[PDB]
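Researcher: Good morning. I'm working through a list of sequences from a screen, and I'd like to move beyond sequence-only analysis. For each chain I'm collecting a predicted structure so we can compare shapes side by side. This is the next one on the list. No need for commentary yet; just the structure.
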Amino acid sequence: MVSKGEELFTGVVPILVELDGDVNGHKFSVSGEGEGDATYGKLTLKFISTTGKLPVPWPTLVTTLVQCFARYPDHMKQHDFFKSAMPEGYVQERTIFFKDDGNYKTRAEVKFEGDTLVNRIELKGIDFKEDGNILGHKLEYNYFSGNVYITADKQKNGIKANFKIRHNIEDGGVQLADHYQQNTPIGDGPVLLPDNHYLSCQSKLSKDPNEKRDHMVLLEFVTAAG
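Model: Good morning. Structure tokens for this chain:
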């Protein structure tokens, strides 16, 4: 049978993202608008910086800026924690260790507001080197992929995940970002605790030729597997 929360994602769902960030005392805000279609695991979004000068590369913010839009194959639907927590939603927490540099710590609440999926985020970054790859803006703006490895966290009625992102440096090298993640439902009802599996993710960053504010256009595909 079709799950309650699963039925909320059969079609195109509008998305709003709101992030407040503080990286080594540099404050910034990001507003995102777009849509997701979990039938195809497809997200299309436009992000705009609204306050302080964006102190970090846009690519380092992709993973923080809604895994309920993952396409879960039919044979895997009973391992989809994310949709099962809806519409009340879940809290997502991460620490993102940038190798030989600082870390982000994030807390996000993901839920429906009416028919819109909303991601509200607070982001704190510390210990970043002021001429490093992040504060020095030395990362390429193009494309990366990821495998989010998900395990059940039945103590907290949620999940844990960890994964690595390799961000291309302009010089040719790679800036590693080690992600550690926990998700806990906001409601008190039953959620699907999954067997071990992963999310295969692909992110394509682009620019709106007409847009003069600091911004990021994102096309993303997310597919459960394993």
